[PDB]
Amino acid sequence: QAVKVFVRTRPTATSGSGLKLGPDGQSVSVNVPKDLSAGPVNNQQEQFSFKFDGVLENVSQEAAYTTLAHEVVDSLMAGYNGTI
Amino acid sequence: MREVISIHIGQAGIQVGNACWELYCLEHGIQPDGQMPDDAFNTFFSETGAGKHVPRCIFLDLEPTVVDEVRTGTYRQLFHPEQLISGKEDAANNFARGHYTIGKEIVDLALDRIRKLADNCTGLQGFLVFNAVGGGTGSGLGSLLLERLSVDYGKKSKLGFTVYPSPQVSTAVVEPYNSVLSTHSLLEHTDVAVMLDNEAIYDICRRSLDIERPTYTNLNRLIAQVISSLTASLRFDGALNVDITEFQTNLVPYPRIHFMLSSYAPIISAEKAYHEQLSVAEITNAAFEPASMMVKCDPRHGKYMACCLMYRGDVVPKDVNASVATIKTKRTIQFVDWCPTGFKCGINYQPPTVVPGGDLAKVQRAVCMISNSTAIGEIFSRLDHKFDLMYAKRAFVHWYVGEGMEEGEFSEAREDLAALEKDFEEVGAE
Amino acid sequence: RGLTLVPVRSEEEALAQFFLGEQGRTTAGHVLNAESSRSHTVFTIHVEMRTSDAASERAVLSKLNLVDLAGSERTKKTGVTGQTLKEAQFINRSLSFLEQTVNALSRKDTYVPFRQTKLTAVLRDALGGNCKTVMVANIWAEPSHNEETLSTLRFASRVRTLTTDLALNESN
Amino acid sequence: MREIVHIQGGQCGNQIGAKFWEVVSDEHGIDPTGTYHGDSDLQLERINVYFNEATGGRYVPRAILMDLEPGTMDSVRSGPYGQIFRPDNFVFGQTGAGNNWAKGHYTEGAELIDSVLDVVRKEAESCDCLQGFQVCHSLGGGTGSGMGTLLISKIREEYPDRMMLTFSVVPSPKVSDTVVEPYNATLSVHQLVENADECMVLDNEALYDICFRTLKLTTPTFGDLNHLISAVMSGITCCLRFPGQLNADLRKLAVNLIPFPRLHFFMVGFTPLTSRGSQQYRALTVPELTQQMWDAKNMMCAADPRHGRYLTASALFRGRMSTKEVDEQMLNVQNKNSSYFVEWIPNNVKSSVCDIPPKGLKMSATFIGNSTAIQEMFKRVSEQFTAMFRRKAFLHWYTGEGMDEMEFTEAESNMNDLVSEYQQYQDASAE
Amino acid sequence: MREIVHIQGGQCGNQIGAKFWEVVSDEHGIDPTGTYHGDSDLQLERINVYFNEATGGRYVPRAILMDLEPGTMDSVRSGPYGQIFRPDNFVFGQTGAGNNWAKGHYTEGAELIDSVLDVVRKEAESCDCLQGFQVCHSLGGGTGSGMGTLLISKIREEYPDRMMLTFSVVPSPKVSDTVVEPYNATLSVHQLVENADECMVLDNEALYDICFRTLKLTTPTFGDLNHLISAVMSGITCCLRFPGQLNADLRKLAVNLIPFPRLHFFMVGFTPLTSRGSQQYRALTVPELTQQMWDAKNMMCAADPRHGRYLTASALFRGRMSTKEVDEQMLNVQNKNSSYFVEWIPNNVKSSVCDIPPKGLKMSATFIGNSTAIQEMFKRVSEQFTAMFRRKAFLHWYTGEGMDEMEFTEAESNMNDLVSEYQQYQDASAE
Numbered sequence A: 001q002a003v004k005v006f007v008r009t010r011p012t013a014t015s016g017s018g019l020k021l022g023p024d025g026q027s028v029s030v031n032v033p034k035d036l037s038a039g040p041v042n043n044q045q046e047q048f049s050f051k052f053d054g055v056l057e058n059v060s061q062e063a064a065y066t067t068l069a070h071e072v073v074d075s076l077m078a079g080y081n082g083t084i
Numbered sequence B: 001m002r003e004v005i006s007i008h009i010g011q012a013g014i015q016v017g018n019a020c021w022e023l024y025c026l027e028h029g030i031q032p033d034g035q036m037p038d039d040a041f042n043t044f045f046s047e048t049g050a051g052k053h054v055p056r057c058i059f060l061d062l063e064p065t066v067v068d069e070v071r072t073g074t075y076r077q078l079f080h081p082e083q084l085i086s087g088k089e090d091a092a093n094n095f096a097r098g099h100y101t102i103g104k105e106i107v108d109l110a111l112d113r114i115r116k117l118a119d120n121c122t123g124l125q126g127f128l129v130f131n132a133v134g135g136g137t138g139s140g141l142g143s144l145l146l147e148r149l150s151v152d153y154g155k156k157s158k159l160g161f162t163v164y165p166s167p168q169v170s171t172a173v174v175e176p177y178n179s180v181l182s183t184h185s186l187l188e189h190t191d192v193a194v195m196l197d198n199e200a201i202y203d204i205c206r207r208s209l210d211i212e213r214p215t216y217t218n219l220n221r222l223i224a225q226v227i228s229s230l231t232a233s234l235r236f237d238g239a240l241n242v243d244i245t246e247f248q249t250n251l252v253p254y255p256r257i258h259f260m261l262s263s264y265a266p267i268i269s270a271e272k273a274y275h276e277q278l279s280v281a282e283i284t285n286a287a288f289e290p291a292s293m294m295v296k297c298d299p300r301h302g303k304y305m306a307c308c309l310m311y312r313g314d315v316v317p318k319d320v321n322a323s324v325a326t327i328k329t330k331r332t333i334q335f336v337d338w339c340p341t342g343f344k345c346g347i348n349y350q351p352p353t354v355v356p357g358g359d360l361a362k363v364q365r366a367v368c369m370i371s372n373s374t375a376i377g378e379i380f381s382r383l384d385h386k387f388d389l390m391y392a393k394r395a396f397v398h399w400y401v402g403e404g405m406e407e408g409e410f411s412e413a414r415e416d417l418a419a420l421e422k423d424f425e426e427v428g429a430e
Numbered sequence C: 001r002g003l004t005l006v007p008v009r010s011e012e013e014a015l016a017q018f019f020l021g022e023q024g025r026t027t028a029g030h031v032l033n034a035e036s037s038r039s040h041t042v043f044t045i046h047v048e049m050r051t052s053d054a055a056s057e058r059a060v061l062s063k064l065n066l067v068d069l070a071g072s073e074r075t076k077k078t079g080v081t082g083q084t085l086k087e088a089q090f091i092n093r094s095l096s097f098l099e100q101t102v103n104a105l106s107r108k109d110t111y112v113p114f115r116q117t118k119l120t121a122v123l124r125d126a127l128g129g130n131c132k133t134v135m136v137a138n139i140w141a142e143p144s145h146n147e148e149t150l151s152t153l154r155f156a157s158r159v160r161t162l163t164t165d166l167a168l169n170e171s172n
Numbered sequence D, E: 001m002r003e004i005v006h007i008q009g010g011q012c013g014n015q016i017g018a019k020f021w022e023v024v025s026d027e028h029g030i031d032p033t034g035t036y037h038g039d040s041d042l043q044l045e046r047i048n049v050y051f052n053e054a055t056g057g058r059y060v061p062r063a064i065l066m067d068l069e070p071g072t073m074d075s076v077r078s079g080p081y082g083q084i085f086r087p088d089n090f091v092f093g094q095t096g097a098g099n100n101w102a103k104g105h106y107t108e109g110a111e112l113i114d115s116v117l118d119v120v121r122k123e124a125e126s127c128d129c130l131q132g133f134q135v136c137h138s139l140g141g142g143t144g145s146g147m148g149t150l151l152i153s154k155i156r157e158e159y160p161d162r163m164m165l166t167f168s169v170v171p172s173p174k175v176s177d178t179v180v181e182p183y184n185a186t187l188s189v190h191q192l193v194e195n196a197d198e199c200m201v202l203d204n205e206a207l208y209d210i211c212f213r214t215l216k217l218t219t220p221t222f223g224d225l226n227h228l229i230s231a232v233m234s235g236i237t238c239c240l241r242f243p244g245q246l247n248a249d250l251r252k253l254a255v256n257l258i259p260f261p262r263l264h265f266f267m268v269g270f271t272p273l274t275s276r277g278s279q280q281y282r283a284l285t286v287p288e289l290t291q292q293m294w295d296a297k298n299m300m301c302a303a304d305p306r307h308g309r310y311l312t313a314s315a316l317f318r319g320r321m322s323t324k325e326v327d328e329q330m331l332n333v334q335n336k337n338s339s340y341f342v343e344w345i346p347n348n349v350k351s352s353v354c355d356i357p358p359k360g361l362k363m364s365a366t367f368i369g370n371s372t373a374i375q376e377m378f379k380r381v382s383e384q385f386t387a388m389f390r391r392k393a394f395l396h397w398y399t400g401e402g403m404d405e406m407e408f409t410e411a412e413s414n415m416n417d418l419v420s421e422y423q424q425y426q427d428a429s430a431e
Ligand SMILES: Nc1nc2c(ncn2[C@@H]2O[C@H](COP(=O)(O)OP(=O)(O)OP(=O)(O)O)[C@@H](O)[C@H]2O)c(=O)[nH]1
Pocket: B009, B010, B011, B012, B013, B015, B016, B063, B066, B090, B091, B092, B093, B094, B098, B132, B134, B135, B136, B137, B138, B139, B163, B171, B172, B175, B198, B216, B217, B219, B220, D245, D246, D247, D248, D252
């Protein structure tokens, strides 16, 4: 009955400088680059980490559906409601 | 040769600009009609062939009432009518309104007029931006204008004489919100920000000027005297000349830390004047008294990093050096360990002029002490919980979001002031 | 009320109705996305069960809302008021109301208002009620998109606090 | 240059608007023939907010009067300031709405609404910059409430971003005028919640209490109540019309007052309300004005704020005054009555100052308080609405006008949701 | 020195022309005896456009009054300005056409058309330069519509390049005067499409509505309707007679108005039409005149522009005015109502300005809009014509006048073709 907050990342065909990482498929971390000019050794904010119910770095739509809403649709046919 | 461009944004900026320009006109002898019956005016006025001097200022507001009061008042023939810029719809205490939707065209026009002003100055010491942190015009438009100025002009010294909301007393409700937003905005653009609190200036007026009913005109007169003392070394010669560019290098240890306490002395009415000697040492002691600070921030909590002293009038270097030596030897005043010098002394031979009808007395000596101290982190600490207290249940957030802002913007601003708190603690700690 | 509920008995007409919706929805040009979706679209699949014996036993009352919200624009690139900024403000307000509802649900306060926007009104049963919700957070990793990515991640993290009910509601 | 379009609806709304225009013309020094006779520059400085200039020196109000019966606007035109209004801005039907919100919103208001919007658009497009519209009317009336809500919905559709201000006379708690007041009020509150950006709740019984206890009048007619309401409607926007030390327009008041969009119903009051006997005996000071301001009796809404919690409260002061005095007084009020003030808002005060007090008064101040006390007014109206709706009393009159029975239930649900909304922020705790 | 030959046809046409000549003589300062009493050089500067000088100081209109019964002409001559017309320009029959288009076009029209053409030629040859002919009459009448269509065809044959202007009073939508109005109108429209280069459509009931609503008259006779029609008829050519900051003659208006030759029917309007009561109250400004101009109620035609789409719109302003003001106002109108304006024409504005306003009015403006809205009028007249022709009611007179039944079907076919073209250009999209 829990909320399963999944995350899906857009595959950058231009392949920009990607800072996100996934170590185990559960946690995602972003490292904002500290501004060297603005207050040297006087900023203290670089890392932001979060934990979710799943991350999808680069998957096909079939895999995305299988891991995203299969259980919810099954619940719908089992009489439960669902919302994606 | 030493021109300084003045910007006055929002009601508070314009209403302190009225006091500022009254003071400058009286100080240079310029009549309110525009012309006066060498070249000390060039820092603030540009003279035309007919003899009429027009001030290098820009009165920006999204509300018509404040600017039309100037257009109808005595100084209607002084300021350039195209320099007076008025909007149609007020920002409504909405930083998003003054920064995203209404402020766009107005800041474009303001940039055009400022470019016309700056093309008229051979040298350019910097900009004096006068706003009030805590209002959509002052916060939003001030931040937008400062961002554009940093982008285009670049390295010019931008001195923001901002009025921050008082700790307990206040006049707005979303004031913590737009104050945090504007603080995030101007943390990276203004070069030296001077903090002012209405509460502290009210205490100054009540205790020293003995005004039981202080008002905005009195507050603005005090602020204008501070600004004139700051700029005195631009217009009038004296021993220990100081410049706007010297302020940055002698006051800002690290770029993030550029918010400054300001304190004037003496603040005495005519009745109590000429009752005390008002010597250099005594006026310096008064200037470093925690009561005379124009921010509700006790300096005893923090540690002074730098103290720039601006003396005006009959002041001798021997007395100033003896006074500052006594200040250093005093135990209550405490400096950081990594700043043994911590003092930027400047004197000037032009005493501050008195505005007729004001409460300030004609004193032959004056001190403007501007200090960078880690104590100022206290005010940021107050605003940081006043913000998150309402932000916990998203009070008034729909208003700001309705003008093209996002919850991410609020989160980013809160994180940035938290980072500023950490910066103050870090620089304070050994 | 007043929503045209279309019965479906084969896959092809379901596809046809959905693609008709795809045509009809409002999309506008934008710098980040060539055809940005400027409207929160909601495609609800209503399932009405009936047993193998059927004959009026354990029927109806099942739902599945597939919702594609509109993007949260910084409103510093759009600029143009020509139905690109004026509607962006509405999108941002709806998203902020949704996030405030999420905050109140995470705090588990008593009433957690849902009427402040049509989005929360539609998703009133969802995000609470008796519905299995699974939020999707589409992010874009770019050197300058970090701020927007972090906003999305913070919203998703605060959403993860929630947990709803699952009742086998059937027809009345 | 920030204009306001005034609209009057129904008998009560039209009378209130007539009195309001009389007061505004008096304060601007305009005689009933339209010529300015004030001999002061500031009066004509911002006259364009409320008036337009005709070919001569005449100044006509930017007002639009609606009614379904012509008798009320015949009385308005026969009134002392009846000739200033545009002859084209009198819009009337033929048969009045028999205190029937359904008639005033669906059957009979539908035909007149096209003419009303035509006149409103004509007035609004003429404006250089439009702050918004203000609609004065009464909840619990057929043409008043019905056409007011319908017009407010239409104007919201046409001008979403423009300010909408409403002065609604909520039916009184103790003594009711019409029997179907709960029905009309419940149906109208549903529209006001969704459409009106800013709403002022007024009760005739609260006005009677204020005029009998503070003004100490003996025979207070409806003229006096309309005069007090008109004084407040002037005081709310004097910052638009006159120079102020710290000015605040309608949108600024709305932003600083409304924490959440649905909680836009405000109880308001005017100071200094002094009896004739003690006029010389009262001392005009800002502390006295604030003390009278924060009294529950001064409120023109029936609900007393002591029961609820002040979400926010704005005070627009008028006169040559010390901002230090004003700010200190209201901070002191907040500190002393912190129990009645919301904790999760550090400062519940929006203080504004204008430099031009109303004529005769050295100082004045209008108060606009958003408090959860209005919960009890909504609750009482629901206690009456449910009692009538369970037995469907008078429901056939509304049903025969082509309004579904489901609409009553939906409106009641919305109103009770608002009640619980107020309760949640009444007993919500910080952190 | 660009002359216009005015012709009045039928009873309605003769009355309208008499009012038109009275208005023009008043504007040029001509007394009923013809002597110039104007005390203004500009009045005589271009008096030759409409009038001719006699041996003395008398001035004779270039008008021809043609009719089959002498009663209307006797009334016109007994009227206040009946003596200006040359007695030879009264061409009358002896037996009138009984509201029968067949009688007015075939049986009784053949004999009098020779004298009519002779008088037309005599008046035209005297002119130095001939702008063209203007014929005032009403659709839905025997002699009116008949003489109009036949004379317009003959003049088209004689002077193909000369401008042809028609003022046709189309039968009113809801209340008709004669029974055979749909028949006569359908027969006349077929001729006006083919022959008349430029035509104005007027409706008695649109006239009634505008005079009862904007003018707010209580018992306004046909004289007032003729007065307003005459004001429009004067304003359409005041550019020819008076100096203009941006002048535009009849052919310029025709070229800028008519996109395709068959779509030459136009609805007109005049501003400022102000009620006597609110004359002092309204503001005489260019924005005000434009706002009154673009109102559907101010349009003199029954068809309202909201239903259709504006192909083009010309506005002839009169008075000392800012060309920037006029152009900005009309561009703003187009921007606002772009939904009602045709997309494949980037600018639907043809603004002309004249320096001499009408007497009494400081400024004025006449409007000429080519919009697809007239489609609904053509459709209504067709709905009446088809209903009558299905049962061949009243068809026997038209049969007995030597006019074939196939002519009715041909006229209906062409009229429905015009309806189809209006729909096609209404729903035609760019690219
Ligand atoms: N020191 C000082 N502060 C002032 C004065 N006038 C206003 N303020 C402060 O300025 C703040 C708001 O300034 P503004 O933003 O310019 O107000 P505004 O002109 O209505 O513009 P917006 O509120 O942004 O729409 C208030 O919170 C006051 O505390 C003044 O005369 N002196």
